[PDB]
User: What shape does this take?
Amino acid sequence: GQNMRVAFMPWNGYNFEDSILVSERVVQEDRFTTIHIQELACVSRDTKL
Amino acid sequence: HARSTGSYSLVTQQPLGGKAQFGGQRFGEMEVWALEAYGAAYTLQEMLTVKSDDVNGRTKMYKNIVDGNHQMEPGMPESFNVLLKEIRSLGINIELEDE
Amino acid sequence: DIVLNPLGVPSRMNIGQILETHLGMAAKGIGDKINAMLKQQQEVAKLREF
Amino acid sequence: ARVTVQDAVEKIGNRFDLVLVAARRARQMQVGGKDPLVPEENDKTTVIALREIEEGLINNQILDVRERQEQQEQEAAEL
Amino acid sequence: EEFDAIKIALASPDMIRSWSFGEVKKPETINYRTFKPERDGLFCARIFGPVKDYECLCGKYKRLKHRGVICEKCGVEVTQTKVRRERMGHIELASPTAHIWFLKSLSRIGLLLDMPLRDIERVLYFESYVVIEGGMTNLERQQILTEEQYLDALEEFGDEFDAKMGAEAIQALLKSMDLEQECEQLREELNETNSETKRKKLTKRIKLLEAFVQSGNKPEWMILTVLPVLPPDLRPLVPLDGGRFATSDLNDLYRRVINRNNRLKRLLDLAAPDIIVRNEKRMLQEAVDALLDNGRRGRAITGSNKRPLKSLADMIKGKQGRFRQNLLGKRVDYSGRSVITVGYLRLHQCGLPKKMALELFKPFIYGKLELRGLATTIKAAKKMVEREEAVVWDILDEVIREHPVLLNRAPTLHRLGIQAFEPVLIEGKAIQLHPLVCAAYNADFDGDQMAVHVPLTLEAQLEARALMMSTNNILSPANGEPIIVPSQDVVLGLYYMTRDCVNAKGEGMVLTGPKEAERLYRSGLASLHARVKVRITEYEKDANGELVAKTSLKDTTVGRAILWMIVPKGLPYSIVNQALGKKAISKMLNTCYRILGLKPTVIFADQIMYTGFAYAARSGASVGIDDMVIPEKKHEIISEAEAEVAEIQEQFQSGLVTAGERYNKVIDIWAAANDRVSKAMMDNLQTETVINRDGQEEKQVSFNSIYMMADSGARGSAAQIRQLAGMRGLMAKPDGSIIETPITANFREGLNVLQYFISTHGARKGLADTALKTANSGYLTRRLVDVAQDLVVTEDDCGTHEGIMMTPVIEGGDVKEPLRDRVLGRVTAEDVLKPGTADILVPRNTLLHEQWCDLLEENSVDAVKVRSVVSCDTDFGVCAHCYGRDLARGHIINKGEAIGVIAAQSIGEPGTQLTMSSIQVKNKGSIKLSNVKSVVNSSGKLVITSRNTELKLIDEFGRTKESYKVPYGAVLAKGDGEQVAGGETVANWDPHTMPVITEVSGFVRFTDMIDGQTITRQTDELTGLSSLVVLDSAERTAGGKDLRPALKIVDAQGNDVLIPGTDMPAQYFLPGKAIVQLEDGVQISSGDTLARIPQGLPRVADLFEARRPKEPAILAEISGIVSFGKETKGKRRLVITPVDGSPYEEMIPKWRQLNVFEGERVERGDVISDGPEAPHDILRLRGVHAVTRYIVNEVQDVYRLQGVKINDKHIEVIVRQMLRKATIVNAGSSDFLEGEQVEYSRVKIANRELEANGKVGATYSRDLLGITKASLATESFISAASFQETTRVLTEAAVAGKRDELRGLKENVIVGRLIPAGTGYAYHQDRMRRRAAG
Assistant: This one.
């Protein structure tokens, strides 16, 4: 994974129960951006019609 | 995932389950206990009558909902008719005792 | 950039995360000094010594 | 009232009867086109009945009289 | 359409032919080139209907041109395809074959024919003949026959006798039987002999035959002659996308049976040898049995995948059957699933993301768009919502408004698992949840998923808003404490801001309002925690509903003044003048609710959450490594422990101390070291803050964040810091023993490899028990709620007689639950009066709210008669006044709701949390003796000569403070009525030596003491004071063992000294292990001895299961003298000789210690043998009240040990349903000893003793069962068939011909009607008045 700064301070209840509060900078610089590749299949058969 | 009106099973005609095939959540057995503990009979009646097991029930519900009339019409669950037919085919007689 | 609840440390019995946090801060401080002095290019031998 | 339903139950006497009476009122209020005797003040269909039963204008005993005078006068009009 | 009941019976061939629209002959199912079904196959469109709606096979009649004509080219009728789901078919079986359910289920034809099952099995397999009728007396009916002697009978008689094989023989046997002759014969011959081993079987025979008599159900239909077939739709052979097919194994079973059926049809007219016909008949029977139940009678018939085929019975039974996964619990529509996240939201608002909002309410969007006129047609609206134009959001913003949505979190343990929230649109993906409700859900924000449902009809919305809204749900149904207590961060902030620092800032400054205090704090001129003087105006409602204000000046911290902007004008200031811990916040919330109302409570809670979050953010608290302090004595304590550890090791290697003693010493010293380390830890952590303010030095409460999070109760406990910074105690290896080498280090200092390896034992075991026993918890919950189905309130007050006596739980130790809470919410059953006589507070019934409780606790009352659920006299339900007030609302329960389901959920939810010589008086009081046989010893003190005596500590008021147990033959250092202080050893007795102390005084000469036949001469080798030795049966001579060795008391003239005041002789009998202390010639005084006799979750599951303990305690059922009869024949025998009554004798184990002797007198329901007690015996001897008290106390002990509080009224209600069966002993309206329902017996006797008849009815006796048996043994059959063992209940209800009136909840749930609970009760009362009026 990545590594970044962290402070242990209860912020306005947004980390109420093990929740994570995140900053806009990490999204700006794409630290946790991932890539997913999927495959789709189209099949042609010879129906009696 | 979120389902409004989609596929239905073959033998019992209930909505399927699983996001990938677009099926609805299973209204499990314990929450039935909870809802009947609350005492909201109509809510569970809708849950097990007009949502999953009424071929001509959910259609009328959808029609009159589009018509702006949220009125409920009940019906005998299809999964109960399949049960009756199966237990009758097992060789044990079973009838619905009408008035 | 990351804010975490502090009350989740003691009862969860995981104290090593605090030591990891301190170690990471020390490592980043060393690297920060290295890059800060690198911007001015004092001496190759000075970097070697440090 | 709107977020709480305390004072309505005294006008009724039970928790399980208020839902029935509110539903019966709202049925004719919505599809019957009946003007609610409570002012509307920008409230939805299933809350004006609750407010009206909070102020206590309808009751099962008096919900069965104005629906009979109308039908008897309709029958008089036909005959 | 509307019906009243359900009918179940046997299927005669007549109606099985009537149902079918045709008969099948061809095993073929479908063509391969085309895909049209063949004629008279398993899919014949003629028999079952057209494949496509309103179409025929050829095309002559179609498109409703001919409505209901039959197409002559093919022979099919034109109609809808739904008829395929209802049309039935039959197959004519060439040879009759036996039903499997009525053959293997335990027999229903074995009893009916009174034959062993093995004989019937031999007959069915074509192995032995059976004589249907024999003309001669040599043979007889129902005599099994082997082939050789069968041929002998053939050659001897021939046609005179009639015998044969196969299911035809069984059918003929059933035909020949006459039911009325057996009915009149067995009933008469039953009374002639009291063979108790045969009474039950004869009664079962009579019941079965009489059920056959009055059911109109001929036994001839037991054997199948023509077999029905399932409609094609329920066994679909449908194409797959990949050009293949898939079908139910029912098709394979039907194919096999029809194939061998037509094979037998061919063989019958082929005139083949009878061996092949017998083989074919055998395989026909095997195939039909496999079809009905594959893996039941023989080897399970497997398919192509070598797996057993699912018979139609397997589709109707078990967890995978239609009952559980398709009837009770179903898939549902208009729902969604998401991940959970935290929110600033109000208590009644839930964050619903916009993307799912349009998907869920899409039909509503279509309707609103149609009514608004922006869409000409429905599909235009579909295109518009597909285009997500701004208009659809304009519709969404008000369509969702004032429309509640239900939220669910699997698993749903208790009633609070479903909550209705008002939706609030949010732009994201996850469901936003109000933090306060999380504790209600037992949900943590770590990826847990959440389900959202939407109600459609107006009644559903009204129910959701008025009943399911989170504001309505504050208190648990289990008990009345709140559920919305702030969990961890709000309490942290409150505990921080309501603090006192002696040297902070601006201390002593005098202020006149909270507003300027908050402006001072915001300006930073004054610290949050600083002592100041503030002017405060508070309010009280001392007047009859009016609030009056009082203004004053108080010394307080700044934060307590700031918090005053939140309290809703109705609480005293003292409630917000503390450190505000967890319990403080919870109790002040409860007080606010119980004083003001509901809406101010929720508003106050919301403002508390807001301010707590805000100030917690403002403060700032972190967990630094330096906060983990380590006391400097840790290594010193380690050394001062290992010193004597090595010393003990050296002592053990010396050999002067045993292994067990060494183990005990080392575990004790390690525990002492751990306690010292923990004490040092708490000393260093609780008052570590040393600060000075215009002085020298003062110690205050710690400012450590860890101390803040531990003391406030937000998370963790002070016991956890012990392993956080000190040694991690001692753990036990998985075998059960505890390792004597502890983990001396801690997490802060790190561990050794072997220390971590050792700790992993306990860690993995703890994970394992949690991972396993939750399944037992779920099964317990299911079994509990199954029996609690139909407990619903029907009346308000039945006007019953007295109920149950109530007492505190002072027994054993300290008073744990006083009378205050144990009766809070109950209703009395009699005119309870204050200790001052003729001062009555209740007219035999009142609602014991807090005020009456205060009035009674002010007085010295200790026992009250309260109305119980079990004592209710209401039929088919309970009345409110017999139950008590609600816990969810606080008022008296109104009719309509269901009590059984909520009680079962309440007692089943904590299941996952509960996986695992001398008497000293402690406090001053008067010593009282309960049921004492006092006597005076040789020293003049008071001693005891009975087992039924108890020690009581009476206070100055009169109520008992402490209770203790004193055994028989004990020595007391004090008498009765002694007012003594605590800390004195009052009662003394040897733990092993059980004396036979004599209550009277006189000469003691050895009588009935014959040496060499009953006793042995042994003398003490050190003291010399010894006498004749009496040993047990296994050690004494059998020559003199016939008579029990008795040592009577004599005098100078040699006569028995009788009991003072009674003419009964006074002599003692000596059992085994009795060595007489005094010699012959010497005597003893009163109170002196003659001979010295030396001496989790399943635990709550077995009680509801009513399991018999392994060594039940034997009690007496009648009073009188206890004597002994048969001796040492397998087991001893105990005779009872009462004053006038009968010889009650029974087996008694001589290997277990007794409480009385030959010369003693014992009353009924008394302890003769020791050990655990059986509830069945408790109910049989003592009344229902005793068993209710026993069950409630025993179950409450386990829940108390784990610190989980449950109101007792949620327990005996199950007991109320646990006691539902009765056994008759008299006659007049029923059988002799059959079991029935006690309420049925009550309604039977409600005319037999009333004006309808003088006296003909019978007397009954209550019976107690297991929870599962009680669940199965009900009037309805679907209720039992939907739970467990469906085959047995089905096959017994079929022969019994029962009908169910649809009274239970799950019955209507299955049938889809309104459930008779709440509004459903308001509908069923109308329906019942309708049916009463006809």
Remarks:
- Residues 7 and 73 of chain D are 36 Å apart (CA to CA).
- The first helix of chain D runs from residue 6 to 12.
